Design a protein around this ligand. Structure first.
Ligand SMILES: CCCCCCCCCCCCCCCCCC(=O)OC[C@H](COP(=O)([O-])OCC(O)COP(=O)([O-])OC[C@@H](COC(=O)CCCCCCCCCCCCCCCCC)OC(=O)CCCCCCCCCCCCCCCCC)OC(=O)CCCCCCCCCCCCCCCCC
Ligand SMILES: CCCCCCCCCCCCCCCC(=O)OC[C@H](COP(=O)(O)O)OC(=O)CCCCCCCCCCCCCCC
Ligand SMILES: CCCCCCCCCCCCO[C@@H]1O[C@H](CO)[C@@H](O[C@H]2O[C@H](CO)[C@@H](O)[C@H](O)[C@H]2O)[C@H](O)[C@H]1O
Ligand SMILES: COCCOCCOCCOc1ccc(C(C)(C)CC(C)(C)C)cc1
Lengths: 54, 68
């Protein structure tokens, strides 16, 4: 009780707080999915620009 | 209210009751004669103080770490 700071039970436990890990997994999947597309676009642009000028 | 037979415990004749055995040479063993063998805890009281302190402290440590 003294260490928790709560007289009833722990806090930040529960599916409302546990689900955030799975939300992070999904968010990271989406973020990498979009970042790969953006990196491919930028790489195509750079490979065009350099070999046209350089 | 009640007849004398119920009060005195017999209708006609008072029956002899077998007395209680004593077991000479040793202490009586009954539900009320157990403090002869089991006194209140008196040997590990200071250890109780120490262990209560350490239990409180360790519980608080791990609970705070879990919460944080
Ligand atoms: C107080 C309520 C009762 C007061 C009068 C009745 C009484 O004390 O009779 C003795 C009564 C029972 O007799 P006992 O056989 O000596 O009990 C063993 C003690 O509990 C064993 O614990 P202890 O009392 O010997 O030592 C434990 C120690 C532990 O110290 C800590 O680390 C706790 C830190 C708390 C913050 O705590 C303290 O002594 C003082 C710090 C405050 C507690 O002991 C108590 O109730 C007093 C301690 C209870 C503290 C928590 C109560 C909830
Ligand atoms: C659980 C075991 C009961 C512990 C009782 C301690 C004791 O010896 O017993 C002692 C206590 C009485 O303590 P006091 O003599 O100090 O009043 O209770 C009894 O005399 C009989 C308890 C019967 C219940 C047994 C269970
Ligand atoms: C008062 C208003 C009108 C209502 C009257 C009736 C009230 C009845 C309720 C009270 C009952 C008391 O019941 C009481 O039980 C005990 C049991 O321990 C009986 O006890 C009897 O039996 C025991 C053994 O069992 C015998 O060893 C003992 O000598 C004898 O007294 C009492 O004789 C009886 O009086
Ligand atoms: C969960 O509760 C356990 C209930 O069972 C109680 C077990 O009781 C067995 C106790 O065994 C003994 C036997 C003898 C003794 C002696 C006679 C040596 C004690 C003495 C010398 C203090 C009278 C003590 C304990």
């Amino acid at each position: 009780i003294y260490g928790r700071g709560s007289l009833y039970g722990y806090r930040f436990d529960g599916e409302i707080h546990r689900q955030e890990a799975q939300n992070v997994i999904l968010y990271k999947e989406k973020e990498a999915q979009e970042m790969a597309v953006v990196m491919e676009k930028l790489e195509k642009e750079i490979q065009e620009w350099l070999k046209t000028m350089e | 209210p009640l007849p004398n037979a119920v009060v005195q415990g017999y209708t006609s004749v008072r029956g002899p009751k077998r007395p209680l055995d004593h077991f000479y040479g040793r202490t009586p063993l009954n539900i009320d004669t157990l403090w002869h063998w089991v006194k209140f805890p008196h040997r590990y009281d200071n250890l109780r103080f120490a262990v209560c302190f350490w239990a409180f402290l360790v519980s608080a440590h791990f609970a705070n770490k879990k919460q944080r």
